[PDB]
Structure formats: C-alpha cells, structure tokens
C-alpha cells in the first residue's frame, strides 16, 4: 500500500493525481469539485474529508 489506490476517484484511471490524507483516494487536480491548479501546501484532503471541516 503506497500512494493511495493510485487512481483518480473521478475517472478510475491514471495520470497525475493528488493523494488524499483523509482517505486512499487520488484526484486529477481539476477533477476535484474545486480545482487545485497548484497542488496544496503540505497535506491535503479531498472534498469529502474536507466536508468533515478539517482541511490539510
């Protein structure tokens, strides 16, 4: 187990994806509800883990 499931939680495919610290999910940046454009500073959570009101 390394670098999440190595798959975009929106495409189920590959490419450059960002791993979530709250769960084993990766995203195509723009594939996120809110697009990163420039990857977070340090840690990061996906929309869901983000709804939890934690962030990073």
């Amino acid at each position: 187990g390394s670098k999440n499931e190595d798959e975009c939680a929106v495409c189920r495919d590959g490419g450059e994806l960002i791993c979530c610290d709250g769960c084993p999910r990766a995203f195509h940046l723009a594939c996120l509800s809110p697009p990163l454009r420039e990857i977070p500073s340090g840690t990061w959570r996906c929309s869901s883990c983000l709804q939890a009101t934690v962030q990073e």
């Binding site: 495919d13 590959g14 990061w44």
Partner: peptide
C-alpha cells in the same frame, strides 16, 4: 500534497458496493 503520476489501465478494477445514489 502528495500528487503522484500513475498510469493505470482502462477496463475496470474492483466493485465492492453497488451504484451510488
């Protein structure tokens, strides 16, 4: 954040649960 550059296939993977509402 840890954003890797994976390259999976395109045919399917795993289906634990059913469709999501």
């Amino acid at each position: 954040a840890r954003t890797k550059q994976t390259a999976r296939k395109s045919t399917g993977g795993k289906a634990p649960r059913k469709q999501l509402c």
